[PDB]
């Protein structure tokens, strides 16, 4: 199902990492490495399938691991109101 980064989130990249600020909850977060890469792909409007394929192309990792980890990561983003439209 269609999803996107919350319109309330500001992203601040700092070499390798991203700091996220949620303007309505007033909470901030950090991402690094693969999390930061996933965030960048979400910023581009990439769908979960596309994100899985990108991580599989860019990292020494098997598809099942990427799928399992991505699901949990997207759920964590959704739980903190950083990502909208998420469904399993």
């Amino acid at each position: 199902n269609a999803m996107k980064i919350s319109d309330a989130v500001v992203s601040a990249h700092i070499d390798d990492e991203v700091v996220l600020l949620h303007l309505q909850t007033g909470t901030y977060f950090g991402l690094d490495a693969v999390g930061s890469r996933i965030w960048s792909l979400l910023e581009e409007g990439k769908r979960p399938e596309e994100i899985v394929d990108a991580i599989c192309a860019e990292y020494s990792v098997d598809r099942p691991t990427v799928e399992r980890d991505l699901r949990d990561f997207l759920r964590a983003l959704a739980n903190k109101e950083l990502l909208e439209g998420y469904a399993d």
Partner: peptide
């Protein structure tokens, strides 16, 4: 190609505004 580690969301808490 890069070494993989599981993506994690780090929470820092309340920002200074």
């Amino acid at each position: 190609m890069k070494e993989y580690r599981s993506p994690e969301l780090k929470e820092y808490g309340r920002v200074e505004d």
